[model samples]
Target: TRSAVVLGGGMAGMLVSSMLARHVGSVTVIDRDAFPAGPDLRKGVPQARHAHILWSGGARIVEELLPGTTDRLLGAGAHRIGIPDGQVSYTAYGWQHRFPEAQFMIACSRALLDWTVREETLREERIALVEKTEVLALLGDAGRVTGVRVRDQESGEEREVPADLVVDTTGRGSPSKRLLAELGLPAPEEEFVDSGMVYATRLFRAPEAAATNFPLVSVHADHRAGRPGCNAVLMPIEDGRWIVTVSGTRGGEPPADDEGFARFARDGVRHPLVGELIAKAQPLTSVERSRSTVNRRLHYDRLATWPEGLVVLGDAVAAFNPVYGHGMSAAAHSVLALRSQLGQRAFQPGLARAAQRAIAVAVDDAWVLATSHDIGYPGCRTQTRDPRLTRHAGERQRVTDLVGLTATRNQVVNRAAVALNTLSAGMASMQDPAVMAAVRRGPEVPAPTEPPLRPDEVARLVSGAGVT
Candidate 1:
């Protein structure tokens, strides 16, 4: 029977394996960690301790690949937060107006989301997961990848398995560039952008009445403010706990201790709302830290030559700053791109290049969104020839600021912006004639001065009940 091997067991690898199972008779997923028995953390994903949001675009695709997954997550107490309405945000410009619901995000701990998606995808009969395994090499010549050499961590036994297809979804830890070089192939063109942002997260027990009914609150940084960027978000996840992440770029890194985490939230960010919210809440975990968020993209599609029966997608192709939370959503879109290339057949002569190109294009949206804002930071290091980020950067930011400022006060533009931010629509949608008309014809309402919390919501916080 024809089969395929997926090189990681994280979100991207799990999603892609389920899609390939129907075409390939058997699908084997290999990972280094023996996945936890419950919704728990694994060493492979160091950033799992932070808050995660699943956008509608990626959420719908997961539901399509593994039906009832969202239901399962919701039943487990995950929040289905309405785009702008469910969030009280202070952006770089000012406090954003609370527009009516237009899109949504699934907010939960990274571990829970990973576990739920993993369980759902594995329900497919044709898929199997191989745990505690290490890939030694890509076993094939320059013309094609036959399979892989793997060593079982427990016994240290090594073996080479021949397969019809090989895909690398190894994420941030992937060594595919070296593996390809070993086969005498040149590395693909790559772009690197680093904001040098450091993240510090702490879990907290939600306030009395806000446990299950609180809006996702956030305070953002203005890269153009000529200072180090500092940001904070308080996301209510499963159970009665909230995951609060506070971050800073370069010279403004947040403190890693308990007292400092709270102080940073209050005094470090642009707004004092997030700091005050956490002041009354009880801390549940020590401050967690991660520095793995560098915006990097491997342009495999631009390679002059690629082997048959081999494909690389997901974080192996592109990894973004977790500050923007586009890594997971972009990975989901990349899986769909690979699925599109295998319309009727599982393997073909031209499949590798086609799938790689499609995946690259799919991830470009998130890359631009993240890298552009990051480039404006004080110590951000950037290298790219893409004109939108280089020669045309100033013009691009003018347009971006226009769209962003308009969305904060206009309903039509707000919904459209929500759609694009959630990945439910493409970048080209912003250029639609209808949106352009709305942009020029805004009612131009005044921006809100206070956080737009409903009366009942504010009553608790203002009255010392601590709800907002």
Candidate 2:
């Protein structure tokens, strides 16, 4: 039985199933919602309204999985933005110096990102997509997962759908833990680092010149400031529009109203760049908000006895704070792990367990980077026995700060930092001796007070900007 069934038809399901199709020959993807006809909002992905960027690391993987995907995204007006050069960012320390391009990110809406992969993956003749279906439970015993029992949402008719491999990519709210426990296996251990962060986003139609040429603008929060952290980002998306997203932790959450939304983007964050740039830009949509910004992980790889045919991927494995924008990339990295494992055995007897462990290993960099930073924010509630995160906290902070502050003006350090931030490389690369030497040498230039907006961009903003 060289067949695989994947639950959830979002990014994770679509991508992984496509990867599996190359090995398994047949694949089925089941989801409850009928995907929208185009790059439009759907209830399945509530966070689609917010800004999303595909870092070079993820962009490469998506390209690897589906050739011509990057061409598709760029053809559709998604910006191929160069890092540092294509962005004006106010960091936790201060305004970052705009260094030369080191890495890049695909700037666009989440819907566009999802739709590109969804459309490409489904085109695979070996993969069949089953929509408007709800998965109920595991089909086999604790030792192996034959498939799943699913119900037709429209008919209320339940039937058994069998496969040799079953992968759960149902995202953050997956019931896999409970579903597995029902099959007599131990539910995987779970951990949480809830910063209580809430996100508010709005669409803006910028002036013609500014809309076409603007860099990605962001103001970041300083966790060490000992107060609720607030941050804002303005991303250039398709159709010459910008998606402005603001986030606040706990007591500093941004407001939902029109005036308050603009005000918070202006007055609430570390810098006013995002707010001021959007001040005169016309609002295209009402403010949309999301409160699902918690970091939770399931220790599936650590399970003492994993079933032979069952596996989990994507946000179901670990959901990071969206502020990092690492979830999409991490999932892509995890699929790389799965692809490598599948190539070796091609759904052999122990493929599920091996792939699960490899996926966990792939996700660790993003998890450590995010949790290490988030656990320090004021009022960030964390539950974990992993001492490394909390242990030597100050020591880690010093090194992180050194790299962070130095990257602003040091080319070597900034490229390495950008690589790490983009998930284009691992911690080892950043921890290399040359990188450490560059960090010690530090930045030669001074951080800028005014953003390094090109004179033309400055003129464009001046012509039609400011919150008067």
Candidate 3:
């Protein structure tokens, strides 16, 4: 029976190992750090403490891999937040108006989500994990990979493990460049786009009454303002806690100090919803910070001579800004692509190249959405040759403005826009003849003078400590 070795035990590694089990005889996952037995933070995933929302586009792929997973998340207290209407967001253009729910997302802590997925994926008999181990190098040449050199962290002993396939899902910290160099292969071209963004997140206890019904609130940064921007997101996660993350680009970085936390939230962005709401809730954890968070992608599929028997997925290939919340979903999509292509046959002569190319297409939409926005920020740095950002910047802004203005009032346009942006539907879905005609004609109804809340809903919001 053929065996495959997966490096890294993060979300991507675990999911890829799960997928490999269906095609290969056995699958082993190696990680430098031990995974927690339950939903708790670890040293490997520093960003787990932040707010992460699983969009329907990624959620669908995950549910396919492990059925009833979404139900498990909801059962564990994660919010099944409906998109468009279920969320209230202030965008670069203006406040998005509430429309009917177009699609839905799973909202929970990164820890809980990862643990849930890991538990479901590991139930297969052919899968196993080796903790406290590190991959020292690839053990083959440029033509094909044969195995891996690993060090047992506790024992200080090294050994080589042979495998039919070696998949790297080690995330942004992957050493693919060094590994390739060691194997006498040329490195793939890499691109980095940093808005110099800083992230700060803290958890809060949800007000008892509003635990189940409170809407997701977001205040987005205005990148075009010629200054660094700030934004806030409040999402309900497990254990009756609200995961709140506030971020800033360059000059507007959020502070980690407790005294400055609320002040930063209130004064940093265009809207104050997050700051106001948190004013009433009790704090849970101290604010945490992350700054190495940027958008980066490696063009391995573009390489003319990709080695056989090797594949890469997740942040190892494309790591996006955390604000977009696409990493976990993109990784899920890549595993789905792998599963689809590798199902009909075993690892063959050209399987690695074919799989990588297919998975590249799987992550294209996320790469475009993330870097496109990051490049627009002041003091942003981009090393990619992708002209989508440079050539079509104005058109993107125009479309975004039109949609932002129309989405606040028109349910049809709002749903179409949400569906398209979230990857739940195609771009042409919004360009439907009727939707295009509406965009050209502009909003058909007047904007609401006051916030759109029913009398009873407003009373509940106020009395339940949700008025902020």
Candidate 4:
């Protein structure tokens, strides 16, 4: 019987394993850490403590992969946040008008999200989980991969787990480059762009009035300021709580301490609204900081020769800045691509190569959106030959800025921007004749001077605080 091995039990690995179970006779998922029986954070994913927004593009794909998953998440208290209508955002250009909903997202703790998906996926009879194990190396030659060499973390014994296919979803710390070289293959070309950004997050009990159905609020950094970028977000999650996160690029990184955390949010970014709202709310969790916010991509699809029986996806192929919230969605899209390619063609000699190329196509839109914006920040370090980041980069930024500016007031422009941001549409959508015409016409109405909060939200935020 044909069998498949997947490295890592994170979101990507779990999703891909479910896809493989339909085609392969058996599937084994290897992970260095055992998963919690409940919806609790595991040792492998430290970033779970921070805010994670699963865009509508991803949420739809996830629901398709595992039917009833979305309802399960909502039943477990996850929020289905509507785009624009349920969002109060301050972009670099201006505050976005609370236009009608064009897209949506899933808002909840990453732990719950992960656990829900894991529980649903592991129900298949053909799927098995092998936790507390580490993959040592790939077992095969340059032409084709046969399996993997793994060691039991508890026993320290090593053995080869043969499979018809091997997929790497080990995330950003993946060792695929070295493993490929060990099999006599050259290292794939890579691109790195780091803004040296740091993220500081804390949880708070939501204010009673703003606890239910509160809109997601975000104040983005103005990268054109010729200084480090600073940003803040306030998102309402399950159990009457809000996940507030503050971030800053190098030279303006948010402080790790509690006192500095609030100060940075209140005064660091373009607006002090996020800090102001959280100030009145009772704190629930201590400050958690993360600094590994670099954008990296491996051009495996461009490799002169790719082996059969092996595929790479998720952060292993391209790790984006979490600030954009595209990592999970991109992974979902790639998995769908893999499933599509495998369904059309037999799992034979060139299947892996075809799937790899398709996965690259899945990530292309997200990679461009993130790296392009990140490269504009001050102190942003980049080692890339991508023309989008080199030639005519200034021109691209100008057009992007123009679209963002136009999106602030015009409904057509706003809808197009919302579609792109939510990942529901591609970058080409911005080039649509109707969208370009709206852009040329410029804003039809004046941008709001302050957040367009409902009367009740305003009253709730300032109940006993102070100024009107």
Identify the candidate with maximal lDDT.
4
Runs of candidate 2 exceeding 4 Å displacement = 462-468
Q: Write the per-residue lDDT of candidate 1 for residues 1-468, one digit (tens) a residue.
A: 788999998999999999999778899898888899789999988789987878888888888988898999999989999889889999887777887799988988889999999998888878889999998898887689989899999999999877788999999878899889997777888898888999999999877667777888989999678899999999989897889999999899998798899889989999888888887678989999988878998887888888887888888989998888888889999989989988834576888778888898899889888998898888898877788888888888887777787888888888888888888899888888888777777646788888777887655443353355
- Descending-lDDT candidate ranking: 4, 2, 1, 3
Q: 104, model 2: CA deviation in Å?
A: 0.5
Q: Give per-residue CA lDDT, model 3, range 269-326, as digits (tens).
A: 7877788879878898888888857888888888878788899999999898888888
Tens-digit lDDT string for candidate 4 (433-467) = 98989999997778899887778777775446565
Off by over 4 Å in 1: 344-346, 460-468
State residue 81's C-alpha deviation in candidate 1, in Å.
Answer: 0.1
Worst 10-residue lDDT window, candidate 1 = 458-467
Error of 3 at 444 (Å): 4.2
The segments of candidate 4 whose C-alpha lies over 4 angstroms from its true place after superposition are 462-468
What is the TM-score of each predicted model, taking all chains together?
0.97, 0.97, 0.94, 0.97
- Relative to the true structure, how large is the alpha-carbon lDDT of every model? 0.86, 0.88, 0.82, 0.89
The positional error of residue 8 in candidate 1, measured at the CA in angstroms, is 0.4
> What does the lDDT come to for candidate 3?
0.82
Q: For model 2, state the Cα shift of residue 402 in Å.
A: 0.7
Task: List clash counts for every candidate, in order.
Answer: 0, 0, 1, 0
